[PDB]
Design a protein around this ligand. Structure first.
Ligand SMILES: Nc1ncnc2c1ncn2[C@@H]1O[C@H](COP(=O)(O)OP(=O)(O)NP(=O)(O)O)[C@@H](O)[C@H]1O
Ligand SMILES: Nc1ncnc2c1ncn2[C@@H]1O[C@H](COP(=O)(O)OP(=O)(O)NP(=O)(O)O)[C@@H](O)[C@H]1O
Ligand SMILES: CC(C)(COP(=O)(O)O)[C@@H](O)C(=O)NCCCC(=O)O
Ligand SMILES: CC(C)(COP(=O)(O)O)[C@@H](O)C(=O)NCCCC(=O)O
Ligand SMILES: [Mg+2]
Ligand SMILES: [Mg+2]
Lengths: 305, 305
């Protein structure tokens, strides 16, 4: 009903079924399942679009969280912005592997052999192994989106898939979702002309689907949202107001500039600081391992009670 | 002067020098040099930005053109949107190589060995080889941008670097450049609130720097622009008007929906259709090889006359 005015992504019915099969198989083994949403959505201004209003998100938080959930034993349904950061691969950009990998001869017997200095691709072998172990166990399903429209439909299909697991399902909503849009009927047909003067656009508020998600689509699930602010004077109050309005369990609050090194875990009655050490930034650890460790422990208590 | 109101990207002075050294070394060997710009720019709406107005461009046209220019003997200065399509690598996304590559043992003597089914990564060895040959010859310099501000400053620094080569330099301007912006003084300081009603924004026209580029920064260079339209009734007229206004040599015209299979090469007095065959889409060829073949031949005639 609120999602009906947005066009469906290609293959939406096929995706919904694939997601339903994934979750039902993992629930049958007794495993917990998390929907990790990651990256930003965009919205068009024209019917044949050449420009988009895009919410900022590299996808690092989501990708790194998916890795940490996989290592903790969860099944992961990874709903992500196409081309944003991908689990295990995101530490090895194109120029790194293009210059490090070298063929060790021509391909013989249908097999290509490659070599690299280990110190040029640190952790590369462990990345390939982790990804391949998850694919083989069937614990990692990837679903791409691009537009706000694609995201809203796929999020509704994922919630339908996870609703049968009751409290064993977790939603980890890290995606940066467009707050404004132009409805299909008010868009010009063709490219906007820059010689036609300043661009004056009014964009309507996107309906906040966290209400129906929590109340109707997945009412028994353990639901975690993120709250992004730029102003440190107001972030706590804004995170608490989110819980009051939407009635879900936890908010992970963060400030744009410090987001890689600090989050605040906010509930209705408490706040917990998670700050990365001097002795932890050296020994390799990422903030997402500490988030996931706090959340899995909370999820255990939620399932048991 | 028109670029002064935009902030400089980090290391702008270091980049300008690196670019100047690249071009001077290639000109000393007698080689032609092309600036390929690729990907889209974005502009912020807030001083601490969480959202951006982004012009659409995958970077495929630019990446594929850089490959074809390298194979034709040019030196290539590749000014590109960070994370958009990268030469040689763009045919092998993360999930393709994550599942295909496997370690053949632990790393011994500091060397990591890997293998893959050749049919899972077709062309992979030839990609590594081409990239490594260009790095070794010093014919390929990569320069990243993200914002409109970063792009405008780096484009001016590249033009300064290529100006000493006179007619042996080519500009191939495929980047999708923001047409509107919000000046530093009219931006709100903090994240815009979605509960505050519809978003109403007026954005000023970005000044068209193709005029000073052609008239002042690189007046002897062979300059090729792109013209993107969505409406096939008007594209030819718009491409001709661009040449009349900016006074450069060639426009590569294209329609959004058919851009992978068709361009029109437009000059002041002629148009040339470049359409990819049935017998060419099978035998592998891309439209950018046919573009580059038409352009290099034109560049020869421009240098000689
Ligand atoms: N502000 C700018 N400075 C430098 N180059 C630009 C700028 N804007 C566009 N370009 C380049 O100019 C060429 C034309 O882009 P295009 O968007 O088709 O036309 P336009 O001149 O921007 N007018 P419009 O159709 O209103 O967008 C392309 O090669 C772009 O890379
Ligand atoms: N329209 C939506 N539908 C579903 N989830 C959303 C939507 N908008 C935001 N979210 C999620 O809601 C949480 C809050 O996002 P955030 O941008 O901090 O607050 P907001 O509710 O959008 N209000 P504001 O601060 O004005 O943007 C995040 O987990 C987002 O993924
Ligand atoms: C800041 C963000 C996007 C993580 O950043 P990144 O994807 O790791 O660059 C994250 O932690 C978060 O706060 N997500 C909710 C964003 C809210 C919105 O604008 O919809
Ligand atoms: C359409 C485009 C961006 C190539 O697309 P893609 O980067 O290959 O997805 C190209 O051929 C082109 O026409 N570039 C000029 C775009 C003009 C603008 O919006 O600034
Ligand atoms: Mg928001
Ligand atoms: Mg334009």
């Amino acid at each position: 009903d609120p999602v009906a005015e947005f066009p469906q992504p290609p293959g939406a019915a096929r995706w919904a079924e694939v997601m339903a099969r994934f979750a039902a198989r993992l629930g049958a083994q007794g495993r917990r399942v998390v929907l990790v949403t990651s990256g930003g959505t965009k919205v068009p201004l024209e019917a044949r679009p050449v420009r988009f209003l895009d919410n900022f998100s590299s996808g690092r938080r989501g990708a790194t969280s998916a890795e940490a959930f996989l290592a903790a034993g969860y099944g992961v349904l990874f709903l992500y912005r196409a081309r944003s950061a991908f689990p295990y691969a995101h530490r090895f950009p194109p120029q790194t592997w293009l210059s490090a990998l070298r063929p060790s001869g021509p391909a013989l017997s249908g097999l290509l052999s490659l070599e690299a200095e280990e110190n040029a691709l640190p952790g590369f072998a462990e990345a390939l192994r982790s990804y391949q172990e998850a694919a083989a166990a069937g614990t990692f399903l990837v679903v791409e989106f691009t537009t706000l429209a694609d995201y809203l439909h796929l999020l509704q299909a994922a919630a339908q898939a996870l609703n049968p697991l009751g409290p064993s399902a977790m939603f980890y909503l890290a995606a940066a979702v467009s707050d404004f849009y132009v409805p299909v009927s008010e868009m010009p047909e063709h490219k906007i002309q820059s010689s036609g003067g300043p661009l004056q656009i009014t964009m309507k508020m996107v309906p906040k689907l966290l209400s129906p998600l929590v109340k109707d689509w997945a009412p028994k699930a353990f639901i975690i949202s993120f709250k992004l602010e730029t102003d440190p004077a107001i972030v706590i109050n804004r995170a608490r107001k989110a819980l009051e309005i939407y009635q879900h369990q936890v908010v992970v609050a963060n400030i744009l500039e410090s987001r890689q090194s600090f989050v605040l875990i906010v509930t209705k009655d408490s706040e917990t600081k998670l700050l990365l050490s001097e002795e932890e930034i050296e020994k390799g650890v990422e903030i997402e391992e500490k988030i996931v460790d706090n959340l899995q422990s909370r999820h255990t208590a939620f399932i048991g009670d």
